[PDB]
Short mmCIF file of C-alpha atoms and ligand atoms in Angstrom, two decimals:
data_model
loop_
_atom_site.label_atom_id
_atom_site.label_comp_id
_atom_site.label_asym_id
_atom_site.label_seq_id
_atom_site.Cartn_x
_atom_site.Cartn_y
_atom_site.Cartn_z
CA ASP A 23 0.00 0.00 0.00
CA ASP A 24 2.88 2.48 0.76
CA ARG A 25 3.64 3.41 -2.84
CA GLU A 26 -0.04 3.08 -3.68
CA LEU A 27 -0.81 5.56 -0.88
CA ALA A 28 1.78 7.90 -2.29
CA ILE A 29 0.32 7.81 -5.76
CA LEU A 30 -3.17 8.44 -4.24
CA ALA A 31 -1.92 11.40 -2.17
CA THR A 32 -0.04 12.82 -5.08
CA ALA A 33 -3.14 12.62 -7.28
CA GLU A 34 -5.33 14.37 -4.63
CA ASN A 35 -2.74 17.13 -4.13
CA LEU A 36 -2.34 17.67 -7.88
CA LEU A 37 -6.07 17.70 -8.39
CA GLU A 38 -6.20 20.76 -6.04
CA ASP A 39 -4.25 22.66 -8.78
CA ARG A 40 -5.58 21.31 -12.09
CA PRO A 41 -7.93 18.89 -13.82
CA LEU A 42 -7.17 15.19 -14.49
CA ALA A 43 -6.58 15.90 -18.21
CA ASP A 44 -3.72 18.27 -17.31
CA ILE A 45 -2.05 15.76 -14.98
CA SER A 46 0.06 12.99 -16.60
CA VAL A 47 1.06 9.53 -15.43
CA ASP A 48 4.63 10.85 -15.16
CA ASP A 49 3.35 13.70 -12.97
CA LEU A 50 1.95 11.04 -10.56
CA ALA A 51 4.93 8.69 -10.55
CA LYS A 52 7.21 11.69 -10.11
CA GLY A 53 5.22 12.99 -7.12
CA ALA A 54 5.05 9.47 -5.73
CA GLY A 55 8.82 8.95 -6.05
CA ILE A 56 8.57 5.99 -8.52
CA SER A 57 9.04 5.40 -12.23
CA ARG A 58 6.35 5.38 -14.83
CA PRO A 59 6.42 1.59 -15.30
CA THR A 60 6.26 1.09 -11.51
CA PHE A 61 3.05 3.30 -11.51
CA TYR A 62 1.44 0.87 -14.02
CA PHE A 63 2.01 -1.91 -11.60
CA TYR A 64 -0.24 -0.25 -8.97
CA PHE A 65 -2.84 1.28 -11.29
CA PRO A 66 -3.81 0.71 -14.92
CA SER A 67 -4.37 4.46 -15.60
CA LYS A 68 -4.70 7.94 -14.07
CA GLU A 69 -8.46 7.42 -14.48
CA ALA A 70 -8.22 4.45 -12.16
CA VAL A 71 -6.40 6.56 -9.59
CA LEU A 72 -9.37 8.97 -9.42
CA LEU A 73 -11.80 6.07 -9.20
CA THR A 74 -10.00 4.80 -6.15
CA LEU A 75 -9.83 8.26 -4.56
CA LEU A 76 -13.54 8.80 -5.23
CA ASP A 77 -14.31 5.34 -3.93
CA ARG A 78 -12.56 6.13 -0.62
CA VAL A 79 -14.38 9.52 -0.22
CA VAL A 80 -17.78 8.02 -0.96
CA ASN A 81 -17.24 5.16 1.51
CA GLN A 82 -16.06 7.49 4.21
CA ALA A 83 -19.31 9.47 3.82
CA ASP A 84 -21.33 6.29 3.80
CA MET A 85 -19.56 4.86 6.91
CA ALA A 86 -19.98 8.14 8.72
CA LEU A 87 -23.67 8.07 7.92
CA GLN A 88 -23.97 4.42 9.13
CA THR A 89 -22.28 5.51 12.38
CA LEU A 90 -24.99 8.08 12.97
CA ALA A 91 -27.67 5.57 12.04
CA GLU A 92 -26.42 3.31 14.88
CA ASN A 93 -26.49 6.22 17.38
CA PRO A 94 -29.82 8.03 17.75
CA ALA A 95 -28.27 11.50 18.67
CA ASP A 96 -30.80 12.43 21.48
CA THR A 97 -32.36 15.46 19.83
CA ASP A 98 -35.12 17.16 17.83
CA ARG A 99 -36.04 16.16 14.30
CA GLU A 100 -34.53 19.32 12.70
CA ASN A 101 -31.21 18.52 14.27
CA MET A 102 -31.35 14.84 13.24
CA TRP A 103 -31.64 15.85 9.58
CA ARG A 104 -28.95 18.51 10.01
CA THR A 105 -26.51 16.08 11.58
CA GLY A 106 -26.90 13.61 8.71
CA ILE A 107 -26.68 16.16 5.91
CA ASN A 108 -23.57 17.55 7.69
CA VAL A 109 -21.80 14.23 7.24
CA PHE A 110 -21.83 14.90 3.51
CA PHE A 111 -21.06 18.65 3.89
CA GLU A 112 -17.90 17.83 5.92
CA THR A 113 -16.77 14.72 4.09
CA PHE A 114 -17.05 16.05 0.57
CA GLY A 115 -16.15 19.56 1.74
CA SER A 116 -12.88 18.07 3.01
CA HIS A 117 -12.14 16.51 -0.43
CA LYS A 118 -13.28 19.16 -2.86
CA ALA A 119 -10.81 18.45 -5.68
CA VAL A 120 -11.68 14.77 -5.71
CA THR A 121 -15.41 15.48 -5.48
CA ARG A 122 -15.03 18.03 -8.27
CA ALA A 123 -13.02 15.69 -10.57
CA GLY A 124 -15.21 12.68 -9.67
CA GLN A 125 -18.34 14.49 -10.76
CA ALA A 126 -16.71 15.52 -14.01
CA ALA A 127 -15.54 11.92 -14.56
CA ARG A 128 -19.15 10.68 -14.53
CA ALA A 129 -19.46 11.79 -18.16
CA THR A 130 -16.49 9.83 -19.38
CA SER A 131 -16.48 6.79 -17.11
CA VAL A 132 -19.02 4.06 -16.55
CA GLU A 133 -17.34 2.89 -13.36
CA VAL A 134 -17.47 6.41 -11.87
CA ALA A 135 -21.12 6.77 -13.01
CA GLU A 136 -22.02 3.40 -11.44
CA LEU A 137 -20.22 4.03 -8.14
CA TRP A 138 -21.96 7.39 -7.70
CA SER A 139 -25.30 5.79 -8.71
CA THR A 140 -24.93 2.85 -6.29
CA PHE A 141 -24.24 5.13 -3.36
CA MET A 142 -27.01 7.58 -4.27
CA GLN A 143 -29.49 4.69 -4.29
CA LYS A 144 -28.34 3.62 -0.87
CA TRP A 145 -28.58 7.16 0.58
CA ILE A 146 -31.99 7.67 -0.99
CA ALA A 147 -33.22 4.33 0.38
CA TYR A 148 -32.01 5.33 3.85
CA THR A 149 -33.60 8.74 3.58
CA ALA A 150 -36.90 7.14 2.55
CA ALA A 151 -36.75 4.63 5.51
CA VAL A 152 -36.26 7.49 7.90
CA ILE A 153 -39.14 9.44 6.38
CA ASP A 154 -41.30 6.30 6.71
CA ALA A 155 -40.46 5.89 10.39
CA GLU A 156 -41.27 9.55 10.99
CA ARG A 157 -44.58 8.87 9.26
CA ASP A 158 -45.30 5.64 11.21
CA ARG A 159 -44.59 7.40 14.57
CA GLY A 160 -47.03 10.08 13.47
CA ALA A 161 -44.58 13.02 13.30
CA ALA A 162 -44.65 13.41 9.47
CA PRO A 163 -47.80 13.62 7.30
CA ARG A 164 -48.38 11.08 4.52
CA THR A 165 -47.85 13.46 1.59
CA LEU A 166 -45.70 12.43 -1.41
CA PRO A 167 -44.40 8.90 -1.89
CA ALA A 168 -41.48 8.77 0.52
CA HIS A 169 -39.03 7.42 -2.00
CA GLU A 170 -39.73 10.03 -4.69
CA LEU A 171 -39.48 12.76 -2.02
CA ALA A 172 -36.17 11.22 -0.88
CA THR A 173 -34.91 11.11 -4.44
CA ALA A 174 -35.38 14.84 -5.18
CA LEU A 175 -34.07 15.93 -1.79
CA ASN A 176 -30.86 13.90 -2.36
CA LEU A 177 -30.49 15.22 -5.90
CA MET A 178 -30.89 18.76 -4.53
CA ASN A 179 -28.18 18.14 -1.97
CA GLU A 180 -25.91 16.66 -4.65
CA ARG A 181 -26.16 19.57 -7.00
CA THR A 182 -26.32 22.30 -4.39
CA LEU A 183 -23.34 21.05 -2.34
CA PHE A 184 -21.14 20.66 -5.41
CA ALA A 185 -22.08 24.05 -6.82
CA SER A 186 -21.20 25.58 -3.42
CA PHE A 187 -17.91 23.73 -3.11
CA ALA A 188 -16.85 24.65 -6.65
CA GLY A 189 -17.86 28.26 -6.09
CA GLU A 190 -20.24 28.16 -9.18
CA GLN A 191 -22.37 31.08 -10.37
CA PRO A 192 -24.99 30.52 -9.23
CA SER A 193 -24.48 28.82 -5.86
CA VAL A 194 -25.43 29.16 -2.19
CA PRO A 195 -22.51 30.44 -0.18
CA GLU A 196 -20.76 27.53 1.46
CA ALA A 197 -21.37 29.08 4.93
CA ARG A 198 -25.18 29.22 4.24
CA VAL A 199 -25.74 25.90 2.37
CA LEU A 200 -26.31 23.65 5.35
CA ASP A 201 -29.05 25.83 6.85
CA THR A 202 -30.56 26.22 3.36
CA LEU A 203 -30.78 22.44 2.77
CA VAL A 204 -31.98 21.61 6.26
CA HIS A 205 -34.85 24.12 5.96
CA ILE A 206 -36.09 22.63 2.71
CA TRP A 207 -35.71 19.04 4.04
CA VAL A 208 -37.61 19.74 7.27
CA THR A 209 -40.35 21.82 5.67
CA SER A 210 -40.90 19.30 2.85
CA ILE A 211 -40.82 16.28 5.15
CA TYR A 212 -43.03 17.63 7.92
CA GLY A 213 -45.17 20.14 5.99
CA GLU A 214 -48.85 19.35 5.29
CA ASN A 215 -51.48 20.35 2.70
CA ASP B 23 -31.52 30.89 -42.40
CA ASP B 24 -32.89 28.00 -44.59
CA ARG B 25 -29.69 25.97 -44.73
CA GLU B 26 -28.86 27.09 -41.20
CA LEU B 27 -32.25 25.75 -40.08
CA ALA B 28 -31.50 22.50 -41.81
CA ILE B 29 -28.17 22.08 -40.11
CA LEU B 30 -29.87 22.87 -36.74
CA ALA B 31 -32.66 20.33 -37.35
CA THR B 32 -30.23 17.73 -38.50
CA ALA B 33 -28.11 18.20 -35.37
CA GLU B 34 -31.19 17.89 -33.06
CA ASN B 35 -32.39 14.76 -34.87
CA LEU B 36 -28.94 13.16 -34.75
CA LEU B 37 -28.53 14.04 -31.12
CA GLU B 38 -31.63 11.87 -30.41
CA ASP B 39 -29.50 8.84 -31.52
CA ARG B 40 -25.97 9.59 -30.29
CA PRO B 41 -23.67 12.03 -28.51
CA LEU B 42 -21.99 15.05 -30.14
CA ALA B 43 -18.60 13.25 -30.18
CA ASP B 44 -20.08 10.50 -32.39
CA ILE B 45 -21.58 12.97 -34.87
CA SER B 46 -19.21 14.50 -37.47
CA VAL B 47 -19.35 17.73 -39.45
CA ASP B 48 -19.93 15.59 -42.56
CA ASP B 49 -22.84 13.89 -40.79
CA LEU B 50 -24.43 17.37 -40.37
CA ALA B 51 -23.73 18.71 -43.85
CA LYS B 52 -24.96 15.42 -45.29
CA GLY B 53 -28.23 15.56 -43.32
CA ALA B 54 -28.58 19.23 -44.21
CA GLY B 55 -28.06 18.57 -47.94
CA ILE B 56 -24.87 20.72 -48.25
CA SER B 57 -21.14 20.16 -48.51
CA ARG B 58 -18.68 20.24 -45.68
CA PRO B 59 -17.16 23.60 -46.70
CA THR B 60 -20.66 25.11 -47.04
CA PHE B 61 -21.34 23.95 -43.38
CA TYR B 62 -18.28 25.99 -42.24
CA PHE B 63 -19.82 29.04 -43.74
CA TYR B 64 -22.85 28.82 -41.39
CA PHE B 65 -21.09 27.53 -38.27
CA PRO B 66 -17.47 27.36 -37.16
CA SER B 67 -17.87 23.88 -35.56
CA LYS B 68 -20.32 21.17 -34.48
CA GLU B 69 -19.85 22.59 -30.96
CA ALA B 70 -21.24 25.88 -32.19
CA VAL B 71 -24.26 24.10 -33.62
CA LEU B 72 -25.15 22.74 -30.15
CA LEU B 73 -24.59 26.16 -28.61
CA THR B 74 -27.14 27.63 -30.95
CA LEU B 75 -29.62 24.82 -30.36
CA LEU B 76 -29.20 25.17 -26.59
CA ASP B 77 -29.50 28.93 -26.89
CA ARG B 78 -32.87 28.58 -28.66
CA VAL B 79 -34.23 26.07 -26.07
CA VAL B 80 -33.16 28.20 -23.13
CA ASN B 81 -34.71 31.34 -24.64
CA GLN B 82 -37.94 29.58 -25.41
CA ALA B 83 -38.18 28.55 -21.72
CA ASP B 84 -37.30 32.05 -20.63
CA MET B 85 -39.86 33.69 -22.99
CA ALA B 86 -42.52 31.26 -21.89
CA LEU B 87 -41.79 32.14 -18.29
CA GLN B 88 -41.94 35.92 -19.08
CA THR B 89 -45.33 35.30 -20.72
CA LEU B 90 -46.67 33.83 -17.50
CA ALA B 91 -45.12 36.66 -15.51
CA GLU B 92 -47.20 39.15 -17.57
CA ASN B 93 -50.41 37.14 -16.97
CA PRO B 94 -51.32 36.49 -13.33
CA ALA B 95 -53.15 33.10 -13.99
CA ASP B 96 -56.16 33.68 -11.58
CA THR B 97 -55.44 30.89 -9.13
CA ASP B 98 -54.04 29.56 -5.84
CA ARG B 99 -50.40 29.82 -4.89
CA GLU B 100 -49.71 26.05 -5.36
CA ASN B 101 -50.95 26.28 -8.90
CA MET B 102 -48.93 29.44 -9.64
CA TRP B 103 -45.70 27.62 -8.74
CA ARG B 104 -46.81 24.53 -10.67
CA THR B 105 -47.59 26.51 -13.80
CA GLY B 106 -44.16 28.14 -13.81
CA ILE B 107 -42.17 24.99 -13.08
CA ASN B 108 -44.22 23.31 -15.87
CA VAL B 109 -42.83 25.76 -18.40
CA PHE B 110 -39.44 24.16 -17.84
CA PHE B 111 -40.84 20.59 -17.63
CA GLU B 112 -42.50 20.99 -21.08
CA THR B 113 -39.86 23.07 -22.81
CA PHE B 114 -36.85 20.99 -21.85
CA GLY B 115 -38.94 17.80 -21.90
CA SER B 116 -39.69 18.61 -25.56
CA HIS B 117 -35.94 18.93 -26.36
CA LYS B 118 -34.37 16.16 -24.33
CA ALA B 119 -31.42 15.39 -26.63
CA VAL B 120 -30.37 19.01 -26.76
CA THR B 121 -30.85 19.46 -23.01
CA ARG B 122 -28.88 16.27 -22.44
CA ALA B 123 -25.99 17.26 -24.77
CA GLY B 124 -26.05 20.89 -23.55
CA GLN B 125 -25.57 19.80 -19.96
CA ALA B 126 -22.70 17.54 -20.95
CA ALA B 127 -21.15 20.39 -22.98
CA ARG B 128 -20.89 22.55 -19.84
CA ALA B 129 -17.73 20.66 -18.90
CA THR B 130 -15.96 21.31 -22.16
CA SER B 131 -17.28 24.72 -23.18
CA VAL B 132 -17.10 28.10 -21.51
CA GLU B 133 -19.80 29.54 -23.74
CA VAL B 134 -22.23 26.73 -22.83
CA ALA B 135 -21.29 27.11 -19.12
CA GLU B 136 -21.88 30.89 -19.29
CA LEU B 137 -25.19 30.67 -21.16
CA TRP B 138 -26.58 28.18 -18.64
CA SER B 139 -25.23 30.32 -15.76
CA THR B 140 -26.72 33.57 -17.12
CA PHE B 141 -30.16 32.04 -17.46
CA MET B 142 -30.02 30.32 -14.07
CA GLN B 143 -29.23 33.68 -12.45
CA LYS B 144 -32.19 35.24 -14.16
CA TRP B 145 -34.58 32.42 -13.13
CA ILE B 146 -33.27 32.49 -9.58
CA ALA B 147 -33.68 36.28 -9.40
CA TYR B 148 -37.27 35.93 -10.63
CA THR B 149 -37.99 33.16 -8.18
CA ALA B 150 -36.61 35.28 -5.34
CA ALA B 151 -38.75 38.34 -6.42
CA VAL B 152 -41.84 36.20 -6.36
CA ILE B 153 -40.97 34.80 -2.94
CA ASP B 154 -40.44 38.39 -1.72
CA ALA B 155 -43.85 39.51 -2.98
CA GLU B 156 -45.46 36.51 -1.30
CA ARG B 157 -43.67 37.60 1.86
CA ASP B 158 -44.66 41.30 1.52
CA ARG B 159 -48.36 40.36 0.98
CA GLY B 160 -48.09 38.28 4.14
CA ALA B 161 -48.70 34.84 2.57
CA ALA B 162 -45.14 33.48 3.10
CA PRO B 163 -43.17 33.60 6.39
CA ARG B 164 -39.80 35.37 6.54
CA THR B 165 -37.64 32.26 6.93
CA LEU B 166 -34.44 31.82 4.88
CA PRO B 167 -32.97 34.59 2.74
CA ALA B 168 -35.19 34.52 -0.32
CA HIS B 169 -32.35 34.43 -2.78
CA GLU B 170 -30.52 31.50 -1.18
CA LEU B 171 -33.84 29.61 -0.95
CA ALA B 172 -34.45 30.41 -4.64
CA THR B 173 -30.98 29.22 -5.54
CA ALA B 174 -31.31 25.71 -4.03
CA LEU B 175 -34.85 25.23 -5.33
CA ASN B 176 -33.68 26.07 -8.89
CA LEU B 177 -30.65 23.81 -8.56
CA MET B 178 -32.96 21.01 -7.38
CA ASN B 179 -35.19 21.50 -10.38
CA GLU B 180 -32.17 21.53 -12.70
CA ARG B 181 -30.73 18.29 -11.47
CA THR B 182 -34.00 16.51 -10.84
CA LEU B 183 -35.57 17.37 -14.22
CA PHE B 184 -32.47 16.30 -16.15
CA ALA B 185 -32.09 13.06 -14.22
CA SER B 186 -35.76 12.30 -14.98
CA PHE B 187 -35.48 13.17 -18.66
CA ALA B 188 -32.32 11.09 -19.10
CA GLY B 189 -33.89 8.19 -17.23
CA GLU B 190 -30.93 8.13 -14.68
CA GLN B 191 -30.65 5.72 -11.76
CA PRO B 192 -31.63 7.26 -9.49
CA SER B 193 -34.38 9.58 -10.75
CA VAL B 194 -38.02 10.50 -10.09
CA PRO B 195 -40.25 9.03 -12.75
CA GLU B 196 -40.98 11.66 -15.35
CA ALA B 197 -44.76 11.31 -14.68
CA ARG B 198 -44.20 12.08 -10.92
CA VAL B 199 -41.49 14.80 -11.08
CA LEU B 200 -43.72 17.82 -11.41
CA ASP B 201 -45.82 16.96 -8.35
CA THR B 202 -42.61 16.11 -6.47
CA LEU B 203 -40.99 19.50 -7.19
CA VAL B 204 -44.13 21.53 -6.59
CA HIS B 205 -44.59 19.94 -3.15
CA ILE B 206 -41.08 20.80 -2.04
CA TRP B 207 -41.34 24.36 -3.48
CA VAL B 208 -44.67 25.09 -1.78
CA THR B 209 -43.77 23.52 1.55
CA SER B 210 -40.37 25.25 1.69
CA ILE B 211 -41.73 28.63 0.59
CA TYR B 212 -44.80 28.73 2.81
CA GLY B 213 -43.69 26.50 5.70
CA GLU B 214 -42.86 28.07 9.10
CA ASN B 215 -40.70 27.20 12.13
O1 LIG C 301 -27.09 14.88 1.89
C1 LIG C 301 -26.96 13.90 1.13
N1 LIG C 301 -27.48 12.79 1.54
C2 LIG C 301 -28.27 12.96 2.78
C3 LIG C 301 -28.62 11.62 3.28
O2 LIG C 301 -29.37 11.00 2.22
C4 LIG C 301 -29.24 11.70 4.50
C5 LIG C 301 -29.23 12.81 5.30
C6 LIG C 301 -29.83 12.81 6.51
C7 LIG C 301 -30.42 11.69 7.01
N2 LIG C 301 -30.93 11.68 8.28
O3 LIG C 301 -30.51 12.56 9.28
O4 LIG C 301 -31.74 10.72 8.83
C8 LIG C 301 -30.43 10.57 6.23
C9 LIG C 301 -29.82 10.57 5.00
C10 LIG C 301 -26.27 13.96 -0.09
C11 LIG C 301 -26.26 13.01 -1.11
C12 LIG C 301 -25.32 13.15 -2.15
C13 LIG C 301 -24.42 14.14 -2.20
C14 LIG C 301 -24.38 15.00 -1.20
C15 LIG C 301 -25.24 14.92 -0.16
O5 LIG C 301 -23.42 15.95 -1.37
C16 LIG C 301 -22.84 15.61 -2.68
O6 LIG C 301 -23.46 14.39 -3.17
O1 LIG C 302 -37.96 25.23 -12.65
C1 LIG C 302 -36.96 25.89 -12.96
N1 LIG C 302 -37.06 27.17 -12.80
C2 LIG C 302 -38.31 27.56 -12.10
C3 LIG C 302 -38.41 29.03 -12.17
O2 LIG C 302 -37.25 29.53 -11.52
C4 LIG C 302 -39.63 29.45 -11.67
C5 LIG C 302 -40.70 28.63 -11.47
C6 LIG C 302 -41.87 29.12 -11.00
C7 LIG C 302 -42.05 30.46 -10.78
N2 LIG C 302 -43.28 30.93 -10.41
O3 LIG C 302 -44.47 30.27 -10.67
O4 LIG C 302 -43.55 32.19 -9.93
C8 LIG C 302 -40.99 31.28 -10.99
C9 LIG C 302 -39.80 30.78 -11.46
C10 LIG C 302 -35.80 25.32 -13.49
C11 LIG C 302 -34.55 25.93 -13.66
C12 LIG C 302 -33.58 25.27 -14.42
C13 LIG C 302 -33.79 24.08 -15.02
C14 LIG C 302 -34.99 23.54 -14.93
C15 LIG C 302 -35.98 24.13 -14.22
O5 LIG C 302 -35.08 22.35 -15.59
C16 LIG C 302 -33.72 22.15 -16.11
O6 LIG C 302 -32.91 23.32 -15.79
#
């Protein structure tokens, strides 16, 4: 793993300064202190380096969210939603270059597309299960289908977080995004007709 | 415009069957009934053909939304939001291949990026002005900053509509998306603490 780790670290650091396209395999071996052929032993391509970096970021989010799901943080419903959204805000916000490049890679790469899609389905299914419980306990009204509600709320968070982290025009300022998303989640989940 | 129109139509029809990358300039001249050099007279590249197609779609949405904004459709607030969102649902839903390719082009093209960004700012500013009026008339509570609320709601619609039109996993079924978005808009806009 040692040289592997070094290639990974080098790729994340270089991705802070430029896109994958403008980083070469020699760039990565160089930064990792190895030759170009030795690189090809650890990874088949620079594309595969990103995949692995993205894979680690996405699992770290997912594991963090599972940790919460095993610990009912003794609190109000607004705060429960906030705490879970914040897992994503912090995890991806700590790995902006990889998030940024991983999103872009979805266009060009079926493995990146499928990884992102697999995790989104999981996070949506968990969101829906929580909405259902809130409904069964009688705290949330039976409005939209829980899964379709979960789907749009997760897609909002996806787009809105990434816009904010990349500083897009338009975007919600990074210091306002969490409140903005929590409001919309809580009002749409608990709000009646 | 006649030959121009033909190149445009040819590009939209071909984009129904494959991505821009897999369509050549000869493909477009051919379908438009002209030679390759004659193509280059009307457009500098196939990329510029998409830009123009996207430009027309985006303006058609925008004009449709301005038309609504000049005609207060005599109705309830839920229906007002629905009618405006539906402008986008129908316009872009009628031009899926161009929407789909135009989104993808944002990565590679600063002009596509800026066109999309300019229109999003306009639609967000209009959304915010309507939220403000609803607040001033006393129908909507003064919760989040109206513009940051508008920003996330528009980004949700962007992502969620496109996912649905491209049939992504995950996505809201196209026949459920409009209700799904209207619920979240109305509950977040009118919902209190
Ligand atoms: O917030 C996201 N997921 C939220 C997640 O589904 C979730 C949040 C909160 C709870 N919860 O507290 O019970 C349960 C699940 C989200 C999902 C995808 C993202 C992203 C964020 O940022 C970039 O890509
Ligand atoms: O719905 C979108 N915009 C909604 C628009 O901002 C708006 C909707 C409704 C009102 N309204 O009724 O007063 C005012 C404005 C939206 C914005 C961007 C999109 C998109 C949809 O689909 C793909 O890209």
